[PDB]
Amino acid sequence: VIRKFTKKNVARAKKKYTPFSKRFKSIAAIPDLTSLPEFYGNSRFENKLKTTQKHQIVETIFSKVKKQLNSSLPARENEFASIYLSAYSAIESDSATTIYVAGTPGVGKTLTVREVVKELLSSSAQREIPDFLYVEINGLKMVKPTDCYETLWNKVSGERLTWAASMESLEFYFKRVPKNKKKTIVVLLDELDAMVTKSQDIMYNFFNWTTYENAKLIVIAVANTMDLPERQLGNKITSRIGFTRIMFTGYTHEELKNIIDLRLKGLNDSFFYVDTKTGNAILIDVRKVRLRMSADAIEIASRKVASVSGDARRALKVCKRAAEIAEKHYMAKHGYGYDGVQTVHITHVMKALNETLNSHVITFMTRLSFTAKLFIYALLNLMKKNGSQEQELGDIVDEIKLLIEVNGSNKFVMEIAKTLFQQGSDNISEQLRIISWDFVLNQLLDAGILFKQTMKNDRICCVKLNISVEEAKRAMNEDETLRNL
Amino acid sequence: ADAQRSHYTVYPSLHIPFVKLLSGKESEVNVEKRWELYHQLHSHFH
Amino acid sequence: SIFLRTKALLQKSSELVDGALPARTAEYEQVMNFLAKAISEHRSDSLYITGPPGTGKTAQLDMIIRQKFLQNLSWFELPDGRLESVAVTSINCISLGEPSSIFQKIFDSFQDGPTLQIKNMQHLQKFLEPYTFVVVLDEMDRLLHANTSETQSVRTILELFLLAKLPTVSFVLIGMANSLDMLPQTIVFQPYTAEQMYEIVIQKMSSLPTIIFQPMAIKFAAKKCAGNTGDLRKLFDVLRGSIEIYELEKKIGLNYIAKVFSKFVSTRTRIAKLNIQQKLILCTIIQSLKLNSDATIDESFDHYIKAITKTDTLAPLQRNEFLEICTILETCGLVSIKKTKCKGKTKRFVDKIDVDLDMREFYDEMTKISILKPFL
Numbered sequence: 001v002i003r004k005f006t007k008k009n010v011a012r013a014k015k016k017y018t019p020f021s022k023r024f025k026s027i028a029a030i031p032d033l034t035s036l037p038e039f040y041g042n043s044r045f046e047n048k049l050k051t052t053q054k055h056q057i058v059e060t061i062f063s064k065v066k067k068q069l070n071s072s073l074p075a076r077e078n079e080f081a082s083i084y085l086s087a088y089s090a091i092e093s094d095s096a097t098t099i100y101v102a103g104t105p106g107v108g109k110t111l112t113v114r115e116v117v118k119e120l121l122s123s124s125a126q127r128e129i130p131d132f133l134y135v136e137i138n139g140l141k142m143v144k145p146t147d148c149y150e151t152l153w154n155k156v157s158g159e160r161l162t163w164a165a166s167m168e169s170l171e172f173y174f175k176r177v178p179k180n181k182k183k184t185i186v187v188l189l190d191e192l193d194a195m196v197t198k199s200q201d202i203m204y205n206f207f208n209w210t211t212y213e214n215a216k217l218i219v220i221a222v223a224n225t226m227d228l229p230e231r232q233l234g235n236k237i238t239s240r241i242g243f244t245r246i247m248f249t250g251y252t253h254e255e256l257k258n259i260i261d262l263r264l265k266g267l268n269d270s271f272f273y274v275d276t277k278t279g280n281a282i283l284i285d286v287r288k289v290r291l292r293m294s295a296d297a298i299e300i301a302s303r304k305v306a307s308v309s310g311d312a313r314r315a316l317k318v319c320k321r322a323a324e325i326a327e328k329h330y331m332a333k334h335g336y337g338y339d340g341v342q343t344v345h346i347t348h349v350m351k352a353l354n355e356t357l358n359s360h361v362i363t364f365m366t367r368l369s370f371t372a373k374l375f376i377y378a379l380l381n382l383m384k385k386n387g388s389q390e391q392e393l394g395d396i397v398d399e400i401k402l403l404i405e406v407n408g409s410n411k412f413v414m415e416i417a418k419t420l421f422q423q424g425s426d427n428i429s430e431q432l433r434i435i436s437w438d439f440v441l442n443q444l445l446d447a448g449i450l451f452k453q454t455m456k457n458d459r460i461c462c463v464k465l466n467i468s469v470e471e472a473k474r475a476m477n478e479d480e481t482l483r484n485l
Numbered sequence: 486a487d488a489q490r491s492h493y494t495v496y497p498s499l500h501i502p503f504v505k506l507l508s509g510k511e512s513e514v515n516v517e518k519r520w521e522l523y524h525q526l527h528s529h530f531h
Numbered sequence: 532s533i534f535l536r537t538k539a540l541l542q543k544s545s546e547l548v549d550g551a552l553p554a555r556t557a558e559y560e561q562v563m564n565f566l567a568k569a570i571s572e573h574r575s576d577s578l579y580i581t582g583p584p585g586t587g588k589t590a591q592l593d594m595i596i597r598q599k600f601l602q603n604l605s606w607f608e609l610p611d612g613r614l615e616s617v618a619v620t621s622i623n624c625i626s627l628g629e630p631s632s633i634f635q636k637i638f639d640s641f642q643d644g645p646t647l648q649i650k651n652m653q654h655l656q657k658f659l660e661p662y663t664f665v666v667v668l669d670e671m672d673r674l675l676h677a678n679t680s681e682t683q684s685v686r687t688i689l690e691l692f693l694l695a696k697l698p699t700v701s702f703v704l705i706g707m708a709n710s711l712d713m714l715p716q717t718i719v720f721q722p723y724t725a726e727q728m729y730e731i732v733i734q735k736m737s738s739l740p741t742i743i744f745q746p747m748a749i750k751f752a753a754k755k756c757a758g759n760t761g762d763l764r765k766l767f768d769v770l771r772g773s774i775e776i777y778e779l780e781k782k783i784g785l786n787y788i789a790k791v792f793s794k795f796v797s798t799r800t801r802i803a804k805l806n807i808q809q810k811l812i813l814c815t816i817i818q819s820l821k822l823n824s825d826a827t828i829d830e831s832f833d834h835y836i837k838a839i840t841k842t843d844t845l846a847p848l849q850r851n852e853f854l855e856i857c858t859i860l861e862t863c864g865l866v867s868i869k870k871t872k873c874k875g876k877t878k879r880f881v882d883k884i885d886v887d888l889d890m891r892e893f894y895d896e897m898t899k900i901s902i903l904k905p906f907l
């Protein structure tokens with residue numbers, strides 16, 4: 001038969017369509033799912049990425065410092081206690097509950113929740129509480145937002161079903177199955193804002209299963225914002241999530257110090273056998289070298305990060321960047337390759353902090369050609385003349401022509417007018433646009449300095465500055481020629 | 486009420502449309518013969 | 532313990548422990564005046580229940596189905612005592628693919644047998660014509676069709692509520708919905724009052740050996756939770772959090788209820804923690820949203836560099852530094868930053884500043900400092 005179109009790349013998973021409510025003949029016929037081989041969880045790729053080294057690589061003194069500062073809990077004790085007490089009471093009373101946690105990035109939400117469920121699993125290993133199943137659902141790690149329905153049911157039953165069948169199965173399992181035939185499930189919903197669809201059915205279902213009497217379900221919902229339910233969710237879901245919500249504040253600088261010095265307990269103020277032939281250092285031709293990080297360097301890093309964000313990732317990356325700068329300076333002076341006392345002091349931390357804060361924008365427009373800077377200068381002149389923050393391109397063409405023909409006594413303009421309008425030939429006729437007109441316009445568009453409107457008339461098309469006018473004039477004043485006229 | 490519906494089907498409960506002329510004093514066979522004359526002329530036209 | 536048992540009974544998933552909720556004894560009779568009327572005479576009528584969230588609508592209707600009641604055939608004991616026939620189902624409408632399948636969802640509850648294709652009101656009507664049938668529809672708001680104009684959005688609900696009144700068919704349709712999230716007889720579940728919440732709380736706590744709360748604490752919690760949103764879930768959460776704060780910090784009392792409301796709920800203190808350099812940035816930003824009123828960072832920063840050159844107070848700083856102080860005002864709670872397409876001839880995405888801090892307390896904190904008064 002003749003097809004109107006073809007779908008030759010369809011890849012369909014092997015997932016059944018029959019839900020759990022039809023799996024048994026009656027409610028009384030459902031067995032103990034805890035005593036089932038495939039229920040409640042009762043790494044095939046990790047050998048793929050291995051090879052032989054055939055080399056002994058050099059690990060300098062700063063390498064152990066840089067590995068100790070990677071993201072891969074002295075300051076989270078009240079939040080740990082609250083989350084642990086709520087989850088513990090819900091587990092050992094066979095209750096269903098929702099624990100809401102919100103915060104800015106890198107303040108330790110995921111780490112605290114994972115340590116809470118680790119200590120809960122340790123409690124259930126010694127029979128202080130009934131045994132439970134732990135499930136992680138990250139909303140940013142799903143292809144489709146409905147795949148969470150597929151994931152949780154697969155973690156509960158071992159079945160592979162499609163998403164509507166999975167959510168029917170989960171609805172039947174939480175609602176109708178008796179408690180004595182079930183197990184407690186703790187579900188971490190990480191990145192909750194990613195699980196928000198147009199119709200909020202996933203959020204309603206996940207928080208409404210926690211209001212079922214038989215469910216034995218605990219949902220730990222981790223969100224960006226305290227008032228995410230009030231901003232983006234319905235009143236029923238906001239009622240079901242609750243009024244009691246746990247805020248993870250940004251870290252103060254004493255806590256960022258505590259985190260960094262907890263990362264630097266075993267190598268800060270310690271000795272190394274350095275082997276100055278290669279620089280490969282071994283922790284206790286060969287010298288005993290003390291390594292230290294300055295406490296005031298950690299102080300200024302922690303103070304800057306705690307004022308700006310309180311992010312632990314940012315503080316660890318700042319200290320790691322400082323160690324990288326010190327290691328680059330160290331390997332420059334010896335030529336150690338990769339195959340006394342060395343200190344990560346204040347200035348490395350300051351150079352690491354300022355390299356994220358210095359702007360390349362003014363440096364970028366400084367090193368442009370004459371024609372691009374002439375474009376920017378004419379656009380600034382038109383912006384101050386007619387007061388508009390949006391200028392027609394034909395006006396910019398006429399302004400460039402006017403600035404060339406008015407400042408015709410300038411020596412640079414005398415030297416460059418023939419280049420700008422004839423490419424210095426006297427065989428090319430006089431042009432209506434300058435040489436490299438479309439080039440510098442497209443260059444300022446790729447850089448994001450300019451915005452242009454989608455019109456096909458070139459003269460009446462408008463152009464806007466996407467950067468600050470003060471930055472543009474500061475760039476234009478650095479040039480010797482354009483600051484004169 | 487089906488008058489508030491968009492569409493509905495009806496199956497109602499349960500021989501020529503020509504009526505008796507001459508102030509109601511036409512013969513019944515004149516009516517039938519008029520019906521057949523119209524039918525033959527209309528068929529001969531179409 | 533008893534803290535554990537009180538905490539378990541104060542959850543939203545708690546067990547419902549002759550057939551009316553403890554503060555709902557009016558509305559239950561109203562539903563009885565819908566049931567014992569239309570079950571006996573076999574009429575076709577439609578009920579519609581409204582209310583704010585957590586007013587007991589699902590709980591009361593589930594108690595009615597549990598205690599006072601083809602697959603779902605039951606006996607209804609009449610006030611006359613005839614014990615007449617009724618098939619009752621209860622469908623939450625959110626766990627449904629499309630709204631237009633609800634008629635099919637009505638069939639799969641009331642079917643042993645043959646499986647027919649029902650895609651309209653007509654098929655379900657002609658299936659229910661040769662026979663009564665009671666369908667409780669929770670979350671009626673899910674039947675609305677989005678993005679399909681005002682008339683055609685209510686398409687399925689008009690079909691359901693029209694077939695719910697049609698002659699010689701036997702259909703009672705009870706539809707509960709929530710008012711904040713959105714002819715049949717309308718019954719409203721009003722939000723609970725503090726005396727009703729006290730009644731509910733002592734009746735739920737009656738199964739325990741003792742009540743661990745002081746009663747002024749329970750009445751204070753009930754009064755602080757009631758109002759225009761009398762949501763019982765909020766009161767359960769407040770009392771559960773009071774037990775939790777007691778357990779962490781160690782009868783309950785009033786101070787723990789007040790500490791719940793202190794922990795789980797201000798622009799004077801935010802300004803007072805800032806550096807004079809940071810305080811000038813906040814003054815310029817609210818001044819920047821006076822002239823433009825939809826301005827970017829680079830338009831707010833352009834205004835800030837204007838204010839400095841006519842005043843010469845503090846050294847003028849760079850744009851990136853301006854943004855991190857603006858990011859400093861993110862993490863203390865004054866400046867808010869979003870991203871949307873700008874309104875103009877060019878439509879591409881820009882970052883903007885919005886400010887909602889109380890303006891009454893902003894002018895009080897800044898007029899005390901003399902050098903900042905040019906920047907208001």
Ligand SMILES: Nc1ncnc2c1ncn2[C@@H]1O[C@H](COP(=O)(O)OP(=O)(O)OP(=O)(O)O)[C@@H](O)[C@H]1O
Pocket residue numbers: 070071072073074075076103104105106107108109110111112259312313
């Ligand atoms: N209290 C802490 N003690 C030690 N390290 C911490 C602490 N908090 C955060 N970190 C470090 O910072 C990293 C980021 O923390 P985490 O993943 O928990 O952040 P998050 O709050 O969930 O943030 P995001 O919203 O970006 O996901 C951790 O993996 C850890 O290396």
Ligand SMILES: Nc1ncnc2c1ncn2[C@@H]1O[C@H](COP(=O)(O)OP(=O)(O)OP(=O)(O)O)[C@@H](O)[C@H]1O
Pocket residue numbers: 236239542543544545546547552553554555582583584585586587588589590591708709720731735763764
């Ligand atoms: N009168 C009452 N006595 C005891 N518990 C009650 C009472 N009313 C409600 N509850 C309890 O309050 C909780 C929420 O009530 P319910 O689910 O019935 O609210 P609702 O009005 O249907 O709200 P929503 O629109 O959010 O579904 C349940 O745990 C229920 O048992």
Ligand SMILES: [Mg+2]
Pocket residue numbers: 109110190
């Ligand atoms: Mg995280």
Ligand SMILES: [Mg+2]
Pocket residue numbers: 588589590
């Ligand atoms: Mg309800």
